[PDB]
């Protein structure tokens, strides 16, 4: 599924990402935009054999188990397939554990490169929430 910008903002607010561990809602909408372009089925195979899954491109090396990645650690204790659903529940749950690490949202390369330091609030502006 490909979310509309406002559609995802509302969903993420419902999934408790409005001010989760010091990160305003705009951060998550922006991250999703540049990580997957709001596409829940997005996947990207990496050189280390790992794959990034879902709307928030969660990596199979540290966060989810897709059973095909070398030194997998499965920190989110969840199968990567669960992150490829039109239902963002699992992606949000795992993303919350990821951001609870000291590295914060810096785990998301696209967020770091295109959102951090910008007016992220703009991403939820003009939306019925």
């Amino acid at each position, epitope marked *: 599924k490909v979310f509309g910008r406002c559609e995802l903002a509302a969903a993420m607010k*419902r*999934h*408790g990402l409005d001010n*989760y*561990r010091g990160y305003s809602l705009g951060n998550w909408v922006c991250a999703a935009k540049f990580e997957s372009n709001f596409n829940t089925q997005a996947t990207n195979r990496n050189t280390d054999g790992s794959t990034d899954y879902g709307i928030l491109q969660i990596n199979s090396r*540290w966060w989810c188990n897709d059973g095909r990645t070398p030194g997998s650690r*499965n920190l989110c*204790n969840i199968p990567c397939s669960a992150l490829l659903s039109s239902d963002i529940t699992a992606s949000v749950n795992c993303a919350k*554990k990821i951001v*609870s690490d000291g590295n914060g949202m810096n785990a998301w390369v696209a967020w770091r490169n295109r959102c951090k330091g910008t007016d992220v609030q703009a991403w939820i502006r003009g939306c019925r929430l």
Partner: antibody
Amino acid sequence: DVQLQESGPSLVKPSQTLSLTCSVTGDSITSDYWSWIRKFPGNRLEYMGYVSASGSTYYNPSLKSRISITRDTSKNQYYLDLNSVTTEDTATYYCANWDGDYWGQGTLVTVSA
Amino acid sequence: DIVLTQSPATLSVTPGNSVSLSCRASQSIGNNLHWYQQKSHESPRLLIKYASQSISGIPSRFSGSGSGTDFTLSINSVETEDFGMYFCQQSNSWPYTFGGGTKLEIK
């Protein structure tokens, strides 16, 4: 599957450092976030803190920086050190993973002269 | 810190009857509210995560609802094994905090 178990002294003196160990069996400590929680005599629970995958720690400000949570991969154990304890630190201590799916059995530590 | 207030402090019920336990937060925490059960001489057991998400291995009679500042844990048809303490905990902001707990006893 995963198993957690606390170990350490059950009686300590005021002003000393209370140290507990949580032994993890079933998987590597490098594969989860680990925490410490304690229950005071009044049935009051306090989340003490946790150490995540990057080694970063989060400590409850209530502990006024007397706490340290460390890990030992080789022994597949993590620890809790609480400095300058007082009778206010008497409680039942538990270790559990961040998700809250796995908990230790809990261990009572009494601080007394 | 975020303060969680649970009510009632104690609740007596006859097995077979249903009950609802309240937990309200001092500020909005979205859906980041979890429920734990704890019996004497035992470690807490996670019953519901993120306000209403079910947990594998937990009896289906337990359900959670709410968002923002008001949350409830419901038990459809209480069983004797359900008597004990119930605590809510928020993970929206550090430090994580627990409500004062609600004791469920047989009437």
